[PDB]
Amino acid sequence: MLEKFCNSTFWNSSFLDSPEADLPLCFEQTVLVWIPLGFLWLLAPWQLLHVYKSRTKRSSTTKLYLAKQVFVGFLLILAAIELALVLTEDSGQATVPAVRYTNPSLYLGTWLLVLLIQYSRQWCVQKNSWFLSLFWILSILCGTFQFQTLIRTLLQGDNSNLAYSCLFFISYGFQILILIFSAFSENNESSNNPSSIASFLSSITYSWYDSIILKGYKRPLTLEDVWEVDEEMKTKTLVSKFETHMKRELQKARRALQRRQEKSSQQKDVPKSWLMKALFKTFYMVLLKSFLLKLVNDIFTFVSPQLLKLLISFASDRDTYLWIGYLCAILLFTAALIQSFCLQCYFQLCFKLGVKVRTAIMASVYKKALTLSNLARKEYTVGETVNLMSVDAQKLMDVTNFMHMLWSSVLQIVLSIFFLWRELGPSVLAGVGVMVLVIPINAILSTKSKTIQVKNMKNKDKRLKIMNEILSGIKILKYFAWEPSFRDQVQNLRKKELKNLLAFSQLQCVVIFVFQLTPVLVSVVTFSVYVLVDSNNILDAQKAFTSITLFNILRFPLSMLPMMISSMLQASVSTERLEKYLGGDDLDTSAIRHDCNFDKAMQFSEASFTWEHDSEATVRDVNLDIMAGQLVAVIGPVGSGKSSLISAMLGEMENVHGHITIKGTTAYVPQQSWIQNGTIKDNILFGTEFNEKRYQQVLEACALLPDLEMLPGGDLAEIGNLSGGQKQRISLARATYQNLDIYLLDDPLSAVDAHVGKHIFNKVLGPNGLLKGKTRLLVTHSMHFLPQVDEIVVLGNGTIVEKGSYSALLAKKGEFAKNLKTFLVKFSIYLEYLQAIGLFSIFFIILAFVMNSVAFIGSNLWLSAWTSDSKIFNSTDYPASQRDMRVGVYGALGLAQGIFVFIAHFWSAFGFVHASNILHKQLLNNILRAPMRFFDTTPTGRIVNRFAGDISTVDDTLPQSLRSWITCFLGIISTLVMICMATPVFTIIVIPLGIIYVSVQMFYVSTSRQLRRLDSVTRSPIYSHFSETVSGLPVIRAFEHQQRFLKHNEVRIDTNQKCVFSWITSNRWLAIRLELVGNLTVFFSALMMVIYRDTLSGDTVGFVLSNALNITQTLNWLVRMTSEIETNIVAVERITEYTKVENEAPWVTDKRPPPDWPSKGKIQFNNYQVRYRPELDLVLRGITCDIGSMEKIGVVGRTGAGKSSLTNCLFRILEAAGGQIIIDGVDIASIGLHDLREKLTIIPQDPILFSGSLRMNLDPFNNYSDEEIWKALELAHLKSFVASLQLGLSHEVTEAGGNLSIGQRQLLCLGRALLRKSKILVLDEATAAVDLETDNLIQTTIQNEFAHCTVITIAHRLHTIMDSDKVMVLDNGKIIECGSPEELLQIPGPFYFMAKEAGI
Q1: Residue 1139 burial (CB < 10 Å; 0-12/13-18/19+)?
Q2: Alpha-carbon dihedral of residues 1213, 1216, 1219, 1221, nearest 10 degrees?
Q3: Helices (H) and strands (E) in the chain, counts
Q4: In the beta sheet, which residues pair with residue 592?
Q5: Do residues 606 and 623 lie in contact, with contact meaning Cβ atoms separated by under 8 Å?
Q6: Distance from first CA to last CA of the chain, Å, rounded?
Q7: How many domains does the chain have?
Q8: Residue 401 and residue 351 in contact, taking contact as beta carbons nearer than 8 Å
Q9: Within 13 Å, how many C-alpha atoms sit on residue 595's CB side?
Q10: InterPro entries recorded for this chain?
């Protein structure tokens, strides 16, 4: 004990028993001081060697280094004064205490080690770390105990040790200041990712991220603001590490499966089990630094339920000394800070390990593709290979994200049952049972929902398709007044969809009701079975409240045991797919020898190559040797292995025997164009430098100059627009810039038109062509290019037939003639969704939720009364009545909590379905009623999207989330009411604490969205590049630029690593700040019980605090929801924006026309002026003429703008400022829009018929009958197709009119008008692209069937215009002409000159 060494008492148990106690001094001066000094000395050698070895370069000494190296020596100055006083006291004739000997001295030894440990620090990247910071903290905390003894003795007035005292009150204070300086991390800006420059403290609190969040709110972020990942995380380093391990295991894996074949010697499958051991040996380091942070969190969590037992008991008995309680509340905060800092780290080490696995597996795929044997690259399809890296590998990231739960669950479940078994006896088995039964019920409902989602997915697609069509043809719909009819079809589709949404929603709400009522049921069943079973069991606050607190912990793990066991059974499948592609046998190119010593560029030695492993070789025993520059064209009978030679050339086929050697680089251009997506220059440059002359020299030969320049982009033009022919040149063009020695091009100009081919023959294969030096082998079937060919060779059935001079080919006495013969604030947004649900439902829903809370606050109070009764009747037997009344009332109090949540939840669903219906029905009505201008300005794509994703967002997401915000808020406010009510003064603290929670939510929420778009933008490229390489694999392997591709993935995977990692850290910054709010509330509230203990009963502490403890999870949850609800609600804003878009004009008016109005047959104009746009000048002005009645009428708009407008005016698609006669005329505004459009009839310029049944296409409203339609079909000669089809008039015309023929499709529209029966009908430049053959029948019908009718025809072809009896040409914003056509020819005027201009 060294009590004699101390010369005083060491451990007096009696010292702490009395109230107002203190630890005996000898303990504080000796055992405690050994703790920190021992820590600092035991682990200094290890740490000093680390810096001694690493020895990175030193940095400028800076002031922080000035102070932490000035104060630390000063602590040695204070140690110094103490040392001497003992020795002066030896001259004071006293027995100086032996502790007073070593204790000042050991310090000198320790303080010295600290000055050395600080020096080394300027020589390593982490300034302060796991060893100095923890030493300091242990010293200030362990040291507090002496500070208590000494201050107390001085307050009494003992001065025996005043001298020692000033030193300890001086050293402790500086000792704290060294911890403060240690927190700061020097602001060297050498690391952009500040993580490399951080102290144990800062990192522990993830405050380095403070800079982005602070600035994120200020302005939008850029791929640039996220700092780059650290090099050890970059793709280059990781792949390397991963690569080494797979090789070793596979070799063994192959060895053992081969051993299975060796077992076959003792007597499909690819080596397996390699993928798993590799992903472990490679990452075992990060693995053994996460098991441990979890063992600290799982063991620390169970301390908090147990300390609560002490605050409850301490309050219960007035006697317990004031000190025990004040110590338990401080102890609470501690175990609430440790758990937090440590769990958040188990997230960072584990969540980032997941990213590592993802990157390693993803980019160890790109590399396998560029060397995979083509033999089995065939089995995986091209889309499927993209999957191996964007679906099956992303699943391996998810399992690793939650891998540790597999043992954490078992532990945090097994310990939790133990503590309950001790606290409440064997009854706790019943309570866990409801938690078990919940798992099967939660699952079945989920399966039922997924069925309904799938059946509903189809209905959605049908509507989307109809929608695409309506918008695509808005002009036509207006022309024939078919819009009202069309709306109905969309609605009938919506009705089926809305009925399904309600049925899923009711079910989703039968899951939220079970989560929210598993906390309640567990309590009634657990407490009741125990009390009722034994009349010797009495519930007390210490048992009940602690058991409740424990339950909340078991509920989280027990729920997860189902999710993970399923996720880790899906992963065995993703691993098997990646365990074959990565393990695939690679291309062996033993047959082809790439070498520089053969005499000729191309050599053959009776080599054989086969497309399939045992299929007969397409090319065998062939021998061609070619000198450089020898342009050779080989034409072989198709199916003679001709295509195969190039395949053998680049190494693609398998080899029966022999070799083919190539000398120089090879540039190969394949038959099917493959285009990397880029601007025109990029696709051509293909990883080479830019030179002005070479580019122009090549481009001019491409002669794509006018073709590309006429196109708007030029170099800027982007291939998302290009026909096979338009870019066929590009496929050859890049080859030209490449300038590799031998070019093997295939069917190069066959796709191109012959005239281009002949000019191009000169450009690349020309005797004077840019490749005249180049040795080129082209295989093609055109002899246009044959005249300048240096050698011509033929090969048949994989056996060469002819070769040598082209002229010799002309007379070889073989089959040349046959060869010739083979010729071939802002609250408004929220207000709208709210106004839509129906404010009246909104009041009832909020009120039942509030009634969930009035029950909640209430239930606890009754439970508190139940427990408090124990004090009064325990010695008795508890009157059996009281036991029963008490058991029952909690029972009902719980059910009420249920009736109210469930009414709230069903009434909500009918509220969301009813919300969606009003929004859609309104959007369709405005968009359908919109003017044409709306449609012209907006790209149709946006309008489809609003009715696509946005109506979807307002159906299955924003509606579900809004349930949690309100619920979680009622929850939070419920607890602060239990705390303010019991201790009134706590109310003041809520105002400061709440403000922190408003600010932390605004910040985290704002930035997480800005980085919420960015992760998505850079996720897409990684998937696309894998596609482009797979479709361009032969080219990229052949023009040997593979290593530029392998290194274009590395930047692309890396831009994702930086955004994803930056996000995974914004989440750690929310958790730490919000948890401090959760712990401060529990600690400040718990002390408040002790300051005001005099009155508080024992139980009140139980309810306020046990509920207070769970303030932590809910606080974060709400910030998470206030995030998704904020982002999703943009969707209600957009749907509302198009509902408020202009409505053009009343469909119908009061002055309906006399019913016989259309029979008039005459039309007039007065000073007509029509704005091209309201802002722009009117296209037509001063238009005045009365057209002929029931007669052919001719109007020429050719060469004149406004030819299109005149039809638009007549059907009044557009209203106009000037020119008007209401009924016998053009001010049809008086009669109303449908009234005018219905009584006029037009046939469109381009035939468009909306998809549907034939009868619907001709008459959507179904206002005619077949007796009539059939006859009309006959008038257009359409009896044959309809009579022939078995369905006939109901034969549904498939989409795009795919089923009908092009001529038949056009004929249908002609039939449409014939049914219309209105004389004032307008034709529409019918022959603009139409052939006369089809036009012949058209001419016959208007000529005969539209007899004596007011046919106003606007036609491009003038000869057709001649037929109309009278003509009124219009041009120059005026009535250009009003003369009969024969008179017009005679008149000397512009029209007659145009007749001369056109050859008429």
Answers
A1: middle
A2: 50
A3: 58, 21
A4: 660
A5: yes
A6: 128
A7: 3
A8: yes
A9: 13
A10: AAA+_ATPase, ABC1_TM_dom, ABC1_TM_sf, ABC_transporter-like_ATP-bd, ABC_transporter-like_CS, ABC_transporter_C-like, MRP, P-loop_NTPase
Helix (H) or strand (E) holding 610: strand 607-610
| Residue whose C-alpha is closest to residue 956's, from 895, 913, 924, 903 | 913
Roughly what angle, to the nearest 10 degrees, separates helices 132-156 and 162-183? 150
Q: Which residue has the tokens 């080899």?
A: 655
**Token digits of residue 154:** 């001085």
DSSP state at residue 1290: G
- Closest to 1082 (Cα-Cα) out of 92, 330, 402: 330
User: Which of the 8 DSSP states describes residue 651?
Assistant: T
Q: Which structure tokens are listed for 250?
A: 């596979």
Residue 1093 to residue 1104: CA distance in whole angstroms = 14
Strand partners, 12: none
1200 among annotated binding-site residues: yes
Half-sphere exposure (Cβ direction) of 868: Cα atoms closer than 13 Å:
15
Which resolution, in Å, applies to this structure? 3.6
Residue in 360, 361, 257 with CA at minimum distance from that of residue 578: 361
Residue 1192, annotated ligand binder?
A: no
Question: Does 647 show up as a binding residue in the annotation?
Answer: no
Phi, psi values for residue 365, rounded to 5°: -100, -45
Annotated binding-site residue? 949: no
| Contacting residues for 993 by C-beta, under 8 A, at least 6 apart | 1077, 1080, 1081
Please state, in angstroms and rounded to a whole number, the distance separating the CA atoms of residues 668 and 51. 56
* Cβ contacts of 1112 within 8 Å, gap of 6 or more: 1074, 1075, 1078, 1079, 1082
Residue 1007, domain member (yes or no): no
Count Cβ atoms below 10 Å from residue 271 Cβ, excluding itself. 19
* 713 in a known ligand binding site: no
Check whether 239 is labelled as a binding-site residue: no
Residue 1201 annotated as binding site? yes
Q: Any binding-site annotation on 1225?
A: no
Q: Which helix (H) or strand (E) holds 1048?
A: helix 1042-1091
Hey, what amino acid is at 138? L
- The secondary structure of 202-254 as a DSSP string is HHHTT-TTHHHHHHHHHS---TTTSPPPPGGGSHHHHHHHHHHHHHHHHHHHH
C-alpha triplet 557, 563, 565: angle, nearest 5°: 100
- Indicate the pairing of strand 632-634 with strand 619-622: unpaired
* Angle, CA of 470, 476 and 478, to the nearest 5°: 90
Task: Answer yes or no: is 45 a known binding residue.
Answer: no
590 is annotated as contributing to ligand binding: no
The tokens describing 977, both together, are 């009411």
* DSSP string for 547-581: HHHHHHHHHHHHHHHHHHHHHHHHHHHHHHHHHHH
1204 is in an annotated binding site: yes
Q: Which of 1280, 1306, 1332 is the last residue of a domain?
A: 1306
- Residue 767 is part of a domain; what is its CATH number? 3.40.50.300
Distance CA 1267, CA 1259 (A): 14
Q: Give the separation between CA 501 and CA 496, rounded to whole angstroms.
A: 9
**How far are the Cα atoms of 30, 524, 942, 1049, 1134 from residue 945, in angstroms, in the given order?**
75, 50, 5, 32, 10
The 10 Å CB-count burial string (b at 16+, else e) for 6-34 is beeebeeeeeeeeeeebbbbbbbbbebbe
Q: Is 368 annotated as a binding residue?
A: no
Tell me whether residue 639 is annotated as binding. yes
- For residue 738, give its domain range: 592-821
232 is a domain residue = no
Position 135 in a domain = yes
Is 1277 in contact with 1310 (CB distance < 8 Å)? no
> CA-CA distance, 420 to 587, in Å (whole number)?
63
- What is the rounded CA–CA span in Å between residue 140 and residue 1236? 92
φ, ψ of residue 1027 to 5 degrees: the values are -65, -45
Among 1284, 1306, 1328, residue at a domain's last position: 1306
**Tokens 């219905």, residue?**
1238
Q: With H, G, I as helix, E, B as strand and everything else as coil, classify residue 1093.
A: coil
Q: Which two tokens stand for residue 526?
A: 């657990």
To the question of whether residue 643 is assigned a binding role by annotation, the answer is yes
